[PDB]
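Hi R.,

Here's the chain you asked about this morning:
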Amino acid sequence: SVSEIQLMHNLGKHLNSMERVEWLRKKLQDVHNF
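And the predicted structure, written out as tokens:
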């Protein structure tokens, strides 16, 4: 039976916006001002 693995593979494509975004959102916060 497969479900969490199919969702995990579909989520990997979504690993750019929301949750991930904080990496990028805090990256511009770093080495800029705050």
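Residues 28 and 34 are 9 Å apart (CA to CA).

Let me know if you need anything else.
M.
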